[PDB]
């Protein structure tokens, strides 16, 4: 389909939020389960 239909700023915002989510998960894992020292 045609390029430009979805605003680049939306794509950027969503992508960024996904990044923050996955990294947030990895930092959660530093405190839970393996690697938590507990």
């Amino acid at each position: 389909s045609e390029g430009g239909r979805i605003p680049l700023w939306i794509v950027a915002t969503v992508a960024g939020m996904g990044v923050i989510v996955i990294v947030g998960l990895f930092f959660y894992g530093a405190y839970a389960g393996l690697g938590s020292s507990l």
Binding site: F26, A30, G33, L34, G35, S36
Partner: protein, 341 residues
């Protein structure tokens, strides 16, 4: 215009990612080195080679994951997947540290590939190949540290392992066992890296602060045209500034930029020479006069003897876990310790 030349044509097309003849060496080896590092650090242990966990799967983080070197008992085995050790077993091969040799060797050929790429593109575009030439320093460092150094030692085990904390360990090991900071080749290295950093900083800042007003904007980046003929900053004002601030100043731009190539590149080459020495334990470890004096005179103290006490601590406290193949058992009473600590 036969098949060789048709192929040449295709390899040298002006696409988003340039390929070239050199790309045939470079892309698979670079891809396998990167992928090998990521595979290893994500999924692969170091239990059977080091007695270490080293993967995300085991609970390590970004700072502690590594693809670790093989057991000392492997010596300098190429440790090929089809070799006499793994014998084709991918899993065993991982457990024996095959990924370390995989990554280092594919990596080395990848670096060859990349430098060849620098030559190839420079030749195609019509510039002098000084970028490639500069890249010889990365090569010297990689080859001296990851290949020659362990080759001089007992086995691949004492090469650096590919990991953040693993590299930190490599550093501390070199202090404790080699007194590497005392080494004049390392020192020349430090001067080249810190001097390079200084040149980077000072040149960038100087150019940015002797700009001509070439626009009306307070954000001044747009007031430059890539195609423009004129210098975008004042070399004369720069020269007077630094002459009056520091006593001396660049006045030749060509010399300035050559010098910027020369300092860090030379630094790294020197550091390489030092590590080639450490491959044989040919260290700058001691000053003999220092030791004769100190041995005879128990009130003589310098920072040099202080640091050796530190080294002695490092060796004794780190060796048993860092060198498990040696089966070191150092009873409590023999561990070197100062008062209380």
């Amino acid at each position: 215009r036969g098949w060789f030349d048709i192929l040449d044509d295709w390899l040298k097309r002006d696409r988003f990612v340039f390929v070239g003849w050199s790309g045939i060496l470079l892309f698979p080896c670079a891809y396998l080195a990167l992928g090998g590092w990521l595979t290893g650090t994500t999924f692969v242990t170091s239990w059977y080679t080091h007695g270490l966990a080293s993967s995300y799967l085991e609970g390590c983080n970004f700072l502690t994951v590594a693809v670790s070197t093989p057991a000392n008992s492997m010596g300098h085995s190429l440790l090929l997947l089809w070799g006499p050790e793994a014998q084709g077993d991918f899993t065993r091969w991982c457990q024996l540290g095959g990924l370390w040799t995989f990554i280092a060797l594919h990596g080395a050929f990848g670096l060859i590939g990349f430098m060849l790429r620098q030559f190839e593109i420079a030749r195609l575009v019509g510039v002098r190949p000084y970028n490639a030439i500069a890249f010889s320093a990365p090569i010297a460092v990689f080859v001296s540290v990851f290949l020659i150094y362990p080759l001089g030692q007992s086995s691949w085990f004492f090469a650096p392992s590919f990991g953040v904390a693993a590299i930190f360990r490599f550093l501390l090991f070199f202090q404790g066992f080699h007194n590497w900071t005392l080494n004049p080749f390392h020192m020349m290295g430090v001067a080249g890296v810190l001097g390079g950093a200084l040149l980077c900083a000072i040149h960038g800042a100087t150019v940015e602060n002797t700009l001509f007003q070439d626009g009306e904007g307070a954000s001044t980046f747009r007031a430059f045209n890539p195609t423009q003929a004129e210098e975008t900053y004042s070399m004369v004002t720069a020269n007077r500034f630094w002459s009056q601030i520091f006593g001396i100043a660049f006045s030749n731009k060509r010399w300035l930029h050559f010098f910027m190539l020369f300092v860090p590149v030379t630094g790294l080459w020197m550091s390489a020479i030092g590590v080639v020495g450490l491959a044989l334990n040919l260290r700058s470890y001691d000053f003999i006069s220092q030791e004769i004096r100190a041995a005879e005179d128990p009130e003589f103290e310098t920072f040099y003897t202080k640091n050796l006490l530190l080294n002695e601590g490092i060796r004794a406290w780190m060796a048993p876990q860092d060198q498990p193949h040696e089966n070191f058992v150092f009873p409590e009473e023999v561990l070197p310790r100062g008062n209380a600590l």
